[PDB]
Write a protein that binds this ligand. Sequence first.
Ligand SMILES: O=C(CNC(=O)[C@@H]1CCNC1)N[C@H](c1ccc(-c2ccccc2)cc1)c1cccs1
Length: 138
Amino acid sequence: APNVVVTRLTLVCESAPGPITMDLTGDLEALKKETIVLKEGSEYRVKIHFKVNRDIVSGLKYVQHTYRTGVKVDKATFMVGSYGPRPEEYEFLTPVEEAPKGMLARGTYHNKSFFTDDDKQDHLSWEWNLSIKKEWTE
Ligand SMILES: O=C(CNC(=O)[C@@H]1CCNC1)N[C@H](c1ccc(-c2ccccc2)cc1)c1cccs1
């Protein structure tokens, strides 16, 4: 088993009608068929769940690349830091952002996420889709 195991991504959104989360331990190809819904203008944070198994790690980084068909990438990088080994998993949260809003903000966004570090180690890379909608349901 690897030292760092990434287990879950959660969109923390207080106004959401239900949990917005994905299991990151399964078929990664299957992850794309799953789409994740955010009402336009919602305040959210991205929460990455991960386990450290054996050794202290340093320089952890979360890298998130968002694509819309035909548009240059929208990239962000987040310092995660140093973590020691323990049975319970850790939770890193980005700062709050506001999802975009308006008719032109609606649609599906294709994300590729990297959990890595300053040693460029690929702790997990995965694609997932996000859908911005006028309301939470349709
Ligand atoms: O809308 C913007 C830029 N403007 C803002 O971000 C301000 C910030 C405050 N209010 C609006 N980018 C778009 C985007 C949309 C959604 C996300 C996303 C991903 C992951 C989770 C949640 C959401 C990421 C980016 C585009 C990406 C690609 C082409 S356009």
